Amino acid sequence: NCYFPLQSYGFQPTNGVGYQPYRVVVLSFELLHAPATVCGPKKSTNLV
Amino acid sequence: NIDGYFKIYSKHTPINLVRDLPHGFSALEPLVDLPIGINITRFQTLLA
Numbered sequence: 001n002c003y004f005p006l007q008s009y010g011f012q013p014t015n016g017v018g019y020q021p022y023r024v025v026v027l028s029f030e031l032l033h034a035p036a037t038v039c040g041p042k043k044s045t046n047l048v
Numbered sequence: 049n050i051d052g053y054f055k056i057y058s059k060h061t062p063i064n065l066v067r068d069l070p071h072g073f074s075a076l077e078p079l080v081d082l083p084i085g086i087n088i089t090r091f092q093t094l095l096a
């Protein structure tokens with residue numbers, strides 16, 4: 001009952017859908033407790 | 049440091065007159081507005 005806690009994923013070109021490796025990014029953000037140093041693009045238009 | 053934005057205002061004035069600190073009128077333009085969001089209490093300065 002002594003075990004090492006960590007092992008490889010056996011990722012091979014023959015693995016099935018879902019058994020394959022998938023890349024993951026998770027966008028968290030924390031908000032409004034201080035000024036919003038990020039926003040997306042606001043659009044612009046011709047100056048008539 | 050106000051509303052979570054920090055603001056540097058400044059003027060450069062090449063007074064060649066030797067005496068200390070002039071009386072006469074001029075005003076600081078705003079240089080920089082920064083979203084730094086930090087509380088503050090004191091400051092220090094850097095000399096060569």
Ligand SMILES: *[C@@H]1O[C@H](CO)[C@@H](O)[C@H](O)[C@H]1NC(C)=O
Nearest residue numbers: 033034052084085086087088
């Ligand atoms: C700034 O000061 C107040 C009062 O101590 C505190 O409630 C607030 O959480 C502080 N902000 C930060 C970023 O520590």
